[PDB]
From Swiss-Prot, chain B:
Keyword set includes Ribonucleoprotein: yes
Protein's name according to its UniProt entry: Large ribosomal subunit protein uL5
Signal peptide feature range: none
Family listed: Belongs to the universal ribosomal protein uL5 family.
From Swiss-Prot, chain C:
Matches recorded under NCBIfam families: L31 (TIGR00105), PRK00019.1 (NF000612), PRK00528.1 (NF001809)
The organism of origin for this protein: Bacillus subtilis (strain 168)
GO biological process: translation
Name of the featured protein: Large ribosomal subunit protein bL31
Keywords: Metal-binding, Ribonucleoprotein, Ribosomal protein, RNA-binding, rRNA-binding, Zinc
Cofactor: Zn(2+)
Gene for this chain: rpmE
Binding site residues for Zn(2+): C16, C18, C36, C39
Swiss-Prot record, chain E:
Entry similarity comment: Belongs to the bacterial ribosomal protein bL33 family.
Any single GO BP term: translation
Organism of provenance: Bacillus subtilis (strain 168)
Record's protein name: Large ribosomal subunit protein bL33A
Subunit relationships: Part of the 50S ribosomal subunit. Interacts with VmlR.
Protein encoded by which gene: rpmGA
Composition-biased stretches (Basic and acidic residues): 25-48
UniProtKB/Swiss-Prot annotation, chain F:
Complexes and interactors: Part of the 50S ribosomal subunit.
One MF term in the entry's GO annotations: tRNA binding
Keyword annotations from UniProtKB, A to Z: Ribonucleoprotein, Ribosomal protein, RNA-binding, rRNA-binding, tRNA-binding
Stated role: Binds 23S rRNA and is also seen to make contacts with the A and possibly P site tRNAs.
Organism of this sequence: Bacillus subtilis (strain 168)
Keyword tRNA-binding: yes
Protein name: Large ribosomal subunit protein uL16
Gene3D superfamilies: Ribosomal protein L10e/L16
Amino acid sequence: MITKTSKNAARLKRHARVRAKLSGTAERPRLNVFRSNKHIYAQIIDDVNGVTLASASTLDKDLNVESTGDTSAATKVGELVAKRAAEKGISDVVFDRGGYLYHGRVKALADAAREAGLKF
Amino acid sequence: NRLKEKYNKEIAPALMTKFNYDSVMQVPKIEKIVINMGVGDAVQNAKAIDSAVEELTFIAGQKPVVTRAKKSIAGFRLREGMPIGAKVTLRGERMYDFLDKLISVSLPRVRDFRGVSKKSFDGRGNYTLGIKEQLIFPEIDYDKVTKVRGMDIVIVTTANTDEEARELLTQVGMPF
Amino acid sequence: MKAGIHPNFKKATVKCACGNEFETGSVKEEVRVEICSECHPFYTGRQKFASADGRVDRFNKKY
Amino acid sequence: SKKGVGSTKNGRDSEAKRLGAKRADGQFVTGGSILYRQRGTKIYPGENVGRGGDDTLFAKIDGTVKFERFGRDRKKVSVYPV
Amino acid sequence: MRVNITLACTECGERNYISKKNKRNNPDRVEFKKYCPRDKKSTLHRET
Amino acid sequence: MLLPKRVKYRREHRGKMRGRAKGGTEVHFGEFGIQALEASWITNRQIEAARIAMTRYMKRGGKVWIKIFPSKPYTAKPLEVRMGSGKGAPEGWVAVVKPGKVLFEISGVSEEVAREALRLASHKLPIKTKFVKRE
RNA sequence: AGUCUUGGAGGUAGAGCACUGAUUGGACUAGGGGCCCCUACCGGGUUACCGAAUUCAGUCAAACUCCGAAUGCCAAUGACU
RNA sequence: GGGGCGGUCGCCUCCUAAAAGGUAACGGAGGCGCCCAAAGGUUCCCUCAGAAUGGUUGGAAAUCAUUCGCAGAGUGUAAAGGCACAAGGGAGCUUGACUGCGAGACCUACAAGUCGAGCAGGGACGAAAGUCGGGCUUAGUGAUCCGGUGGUUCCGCAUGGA
RNA sequence: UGGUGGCGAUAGCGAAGAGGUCACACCCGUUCCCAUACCGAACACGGAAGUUAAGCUCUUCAGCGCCGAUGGUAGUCGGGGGUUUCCCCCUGUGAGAGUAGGACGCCGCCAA
RNA sequence: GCCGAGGUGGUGGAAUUGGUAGACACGCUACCUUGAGGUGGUAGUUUACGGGUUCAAGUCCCGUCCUCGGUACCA
């Protein structure tokens, strides 16, 4: 037969482990990360209102990159996250690595947001 | 290398037009090969674990895990732990290399060899070879053999029903 | 793959005493074989030696 | 007649420990005050309620107390302010 | 058997701590770094 | 000697006999049955004697169908012993019979033989009982 | 303090078998005997002689609960008294 | 349920116990006078028992894959309560099995017992958020007096010491 | 379409269908970061040869699961009566089981 | 039924977890010696049971069966 569960099913489980201990409160919004094969995506979510405040994706035809899935694409979308988080002034944020490691594209996002000025 | 190309070129059109699949991805592929060892003298022979930590590293260079018993059994004088049996899982290039070792080189050396059983499929599409002599493919070296402890090979396809795993493993080269 | 744990793998030029060669990847760089598949007589249909030998006694009346 | 058999073997018993609700719903409740003595988690901590080392539910802030429910079949203490 | 253990400091020599250990599962003299309130820092302690 | 093979707790409370029976109030396994109009404890020996009287009068029973089983044990201290010092040792097994409970049934046998068979069963029971047809 | 309204905690009486124990019968059912046949206890041939586990249908429980009262209890909220 | 005998004397869990809490009897059952330097902390991972099949010696049942299995397993240990977002399993790194405390609560005749956000000092893990003042909660223990040991800007029978 | 949340599976399971240029995925490899008590399965690092078969969505439907009345009953607060190990009556209350039925998604936010 | 005690080879019986079909004294078997016996000399046969704990079990632990005795109905 042999069947395997998806990346997405275990990813949502491994994310739901993460979700028990950090949420999108007032003045610490939750900075979420989704990791597609061809792009990467990052939202800044209030969990009290259920509303994402700012957003940035590599699915942006403005300010594009070539590889779109590289760690440099993740660094550019992390500085775009922080740039939209600077235009609407939250200034302090809590990083949700969403069921992943803190290793590659996620760590590139996080390091880019820490450099650009989001205080995790 | 050679069995992958054999599989793709000869098998995938032939099996695809033999079982009339609605997509290229429904064609079964051998996903993994699990080599059970099943040495239960670890209790009674404290050194014996190194046997098939010695041997199965030579059988396939992926080192097997010294696996532990998950439940205490009083009739076997055994508590949880006291590790029992080795285990290789296999996917990559060495696995088509391993079936190349089994089909073309090893299975002649079974000293009482006949048609290995048709009735060794579980009802889902997976197969096991039950081996009684641990020296079949020429690396095993009678010189370096004292304990005769055989082997269980678990060839695991992606087949959804059973007889198309039958028609896979006949075409790869397993005789029956 | 873990380094320092597994033994090596080179392209085994598996031979046979019938001369048939085959290519795998093993621990041994080269493997000498005494009986391959194409050498083994069961794969080659009804064999010469053992099928000519395995005739049961034809009730030896002859004399 | 008095024929002797003894040995009850079952005299003893432990001291009653007072598990259960110590405060009610809609009760004004200061900080640090025990809301629910239990064993296990018969009732979970919700908002502004912490679970202790002996898994008692205590209030972290001042405010009223609500015993809501955790959805399927499961309860919850939560303390809200005014 | 299980023994009561004092864990005297090395920077101060002061005792400051007690926990228990085996004489069989821990036959050697055990050492940890704990907080010495005379030294006001983390300090390696020592069974005495 | 109907006996449960194993019981968790060999010494139980005596319980209370109130309300009707939960179930078995109607005959559905047999054709003709016997209900209890009152409540009691029926021991092993009453089911023995009643069932033996049933079997001896029917002389070839279709089915006999005993619905009550002696699950509850009753204990008793030995003779001439003072009160206290523990609960007494268990002596017997009892089926609790609430009112309106079909005790025995009969199948495959005509109505008059079933009447007289359940009558010989009924005179071994402490209860007032009545005959019950299938409805 | 009482009562009305309102919110809660708690799982008994009842009921039910969804756990845990008990347990009635039918259907099948690996298997254990016994009649034996020869016979390397090997292969069997039978029985209305017992049957582990499956299923349907029924029972029962202070230390059984998928459920769950009336009350009592803790409150707040106003209302009177 | 006279006294003696037997049995018991302290602590924990269930039932009695009557849907808050409590509640007795020489009522029904059981446990305790510990264990663990990881069986603690944190971080990152991940899921159990059985059954049906395929499998030497492997047996009814070790280990293996393979489907079905939101729960029987597991939870150091009685029993209850609880747990698959793990409290159950792994591995790394570790010593918070910290010091001074502690608003406020539960419990209770007292003596005691339990919970405690938070603060400061110093750390552990973590990128951070954070979590950590032992273990999954409740047992695993006893007052004072008198002595021992260690340390202390304490006293020291006129003064300096003792 | 994709991500993310709240709502008690009325969300589920199971059965039969449909969709891919974008989008999520299946896939193709490990040269470095990382990893696997075994292993590129996973986790990571990359890519785009093909793949709608699977996840994923999107339809139906009541086979298991779930929610679920009204009535009637058991029980019971209070009052009363009797031959009182129990039973009956009255005022109020009122299950559980069984049902008629509801249901194979509602509601937000963001990006295309 | 309750309490207390022991259940080994044909026999009586020691053995603080560490090698016992038996280690110790008798029987028993095969041989030798003697005319043939006896004595004498040589060699030889799983711990009441079932299930654990343990690297190791007669022993430590949980249950079943038997026998001695005390403690009862009755004669």
